[PDB]
Amino acid sequence: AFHVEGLIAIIVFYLLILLVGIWAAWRTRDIGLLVGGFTMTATWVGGGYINGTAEAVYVPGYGLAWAQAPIGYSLSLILGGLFFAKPMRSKGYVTMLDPFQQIYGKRMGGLLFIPALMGEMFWAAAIFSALGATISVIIDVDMHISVIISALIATLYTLVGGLYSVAYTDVVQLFCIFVGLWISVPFALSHPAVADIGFTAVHAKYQKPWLGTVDSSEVYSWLDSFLLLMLGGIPWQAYFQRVLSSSSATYAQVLSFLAAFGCLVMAIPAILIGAIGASTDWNQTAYGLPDPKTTEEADMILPIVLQYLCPVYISFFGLGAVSAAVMSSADSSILSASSMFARNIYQLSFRSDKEIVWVMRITVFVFGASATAMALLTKTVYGLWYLSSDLVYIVIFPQLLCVLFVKGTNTYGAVAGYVSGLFLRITGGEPYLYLQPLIFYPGYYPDDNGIYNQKFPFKTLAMVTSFLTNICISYLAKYLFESGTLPPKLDVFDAV
Ligand SMILES: C[N+](C)(C)CCO
Ligand SMILES: [Cl-]
Ligand code: NA
């Protein structure tokens, strides 16, 4: 029943992506800055960007007003270029966890690896879910098998590309994403089922208007989420790997700015596809009634629009664009997680080149399997894409601010900030993971599923409490050990 045309199309597109990169690696006027910016854009923009942005715009509860992850994650690159690019450079940093291990120690750096590893896993699960949904809709494959196949192909791509040389694969992949999406959009807009997306943005005919709305009581919560996506999107090894490998600090800053511009440009057609899905009379298409959000297939809105509103070859171009985005992001995500585990955890704390290569291969496999299980269990792409930066914002970002800008931080403040931020984040609950809150801040309300949500900005409160606890406990421990109030024999971490 499945169309073999789709399988042959994804095969030929994958080969077309890899062959040009192999040729460019075989071969290899002030244009390298553009190439670096395009490569960073291809690293940043994956299945999360495209599919999660379309889902967030499509879902009536969110709209464009609540599709904050594309804008926030693009602004993360601008903020990184402005403030974090120079302090991370000119030091012997290979990974993002190197400042943490150099200032707080190996154990605290390994502890800080856990939020980063969980964020990488959430991002990989979101992009695996996006690719599996695209394959399942367009090639008509079972969703579980499609997700497993996507994870397998991403794993083999990362491994095969790793040992050999790849040059300018990301440029060609970004070109494929851009062309596929921007040729899919005009075909989707001209479908007889799709109504005027300008009218649907401000008026409701099929569902609530896709521009979205923010209530006056929700404003703080909106701001809270935006901060989580704008500041929690900065401390990632996929970005700092390109920052540290640059020739100069100015080159790193300019590639950050160009990458942010490219991310916004890539986010535009995803917003348009989500708006088209929100403006579609599904009773007129072959998808039929019920509509995708009634079917609980909202997270699959972008492939559905590609499949049921576009011709078959345009659907194949869109599938190629999604595949290019997912491969170019999954390579960086898997490699960053594996490199951080191999260098910071295995090589530095516990301990050979062959041994390191082998543990990094098996780590790629285990990370892929964990992300596959997470992708199979969940039902949302935007939710995992959002949650990837949640614990990063809560935990790593205050510690990153402390190690870069706050002179005098130590391990006691790091541990205190870790515990305080984690406690305030956990006690606030998580609706995506169906967790009840223990602390009930003012404005709490139950959703459809019965989990109490928080209108109070408790995530930003947890982050700020983590930062202030780090500073206060660090200076208090320094004062207590310097003045002689606390005996020096109790300095378990030997920080001061
Ligand atoms: C999820 N990240 C923040 C790592 C990349 C944005 O797509
Ligand atoms: Cl993404
Ligand atoms: Na990508």
UniProtKB/Swiss-Prot annotation:
How the protein is affected by changing residue 397 to V? Answer: In CMS20; uncertain significance
PTM comment, free text: Phosphorylated.
Q: Which CDD domains match?
A: SLC5sbd_CHT (cd11474)
Lineage, top-rank taxon, reads Eukaryota
Question: Where does the UniProt entry say this protein principally localizes?
Answer: membrane
Extract the Pfam families matched here: SSF
Alphabetically, which GO biological process terms does the record hold? acetylcholine biosynthetic process; choline transport; in utero embryonic development; neuromuscular synaptic transmission; neurotransmitter transport; synaptic transmission, cholinergic; transmembrane transport
Q: What's the pH dependence, according to the entry?
A: Optimum pH is 9.5 for choline uptake. Transport efficiency decreased at more acidic pHs and is abolished at pH 5.5, which should coincide with transporter internalization.
Which locations, inside or outside the cell, does it occupy? Presynaptic cell membrane; Cell projection, Axon; Early endosome membrane; Cytoplasmic vesicle, Secretory vesicle, Synaptic vesicle membrane
Q: What is the effect of changing residue 30 to G?
A: In CMS20; decreased choline transmembrane transporter activity; no effect on localization at plasma membrane
Question: How would you summarize where this protein is expressed among tissues?
Answer: Expressed in putamen, spinal cord and medulla. Expressed in cholinergic neurons.
* Lipid bilayer topology: Multi-pass membrane protein
| Gene Ontology terms for molecular function | choline binding; choline transmembrane transporter activity; choline:sodium symporter activity
Residues annotated as transmembrane: 6-26, 31-51, 64-84, 108-128, 147-167, 174-194, 220-240, 257-277, 300-320, 356-376, 386-406, 415-435, 461-481
Which illness does the annotation name? Neuronopathy, distal hereditary motor, autosomal dominant 7: A form of distal hereditary motor neuronopathy, a heterogeneous group of neuromuscular disorders caused by selective degeneration of motor neurons in the anterior horn of the spinal cord, without sensory deficit in the posterior horn. The overall clinical picture consists of a classical distal muscular atrophy syndrome in the legs without clinical sensory loss. The disease starts with weakness and wasting of distal muscles of the anterior tibial and peroneal compartments of the legs. Myasthenic syndrome, congenital, 20, presynaptic: A form of congenital myasthenic syndrome, a group of disorders characterized by failure of neuromuscular transmission, including pre-synaptic, synaptic, and post-synaptic disorders that are not of autoimmune origin. Clinical features are easy fatigability and muscle weakness. CMS20 is an autosomal recessive, pre-synaptic form characterized by severe hypotonia and episodic apnea soon after birth, generalized limb fatigability and weakness, delayed walking, ptosis, poor sucking and swallowing.
Role, per record: High-affinity Na(+)-coupled choline transmembrane symporter. Functions as an electrogenic, voltage-dependent transporter with variable charge/choline stoichiometry. Choline uptake and choline-induced current is also Cl(-)-dependent where Cl(-) is likely a regulatory ion rather than cotransported ion. Plays a critical role in acetylcholine (ACh) synthesis by taking up the substrate choline from the synaptic cleft into the presynaptic nerve terminals after neurotransmitter release.
Q: Read off the domain note.
A: The C-terminal dileucine-like motif (DKTILV) controls SLC5A7/CHT1 internalization in clathrin-coated vesicles to early endosomes as well as choline transporter activity.
Family that this chain belongs to: Belongs to the sodium:solute symporter (SSF) (TC 2.A.21) family.
UniProt-recorded name of the protein: High affinity choline transporter 1
| Natural source organism | Homo sapiens
Gene (name only): SLC5A7
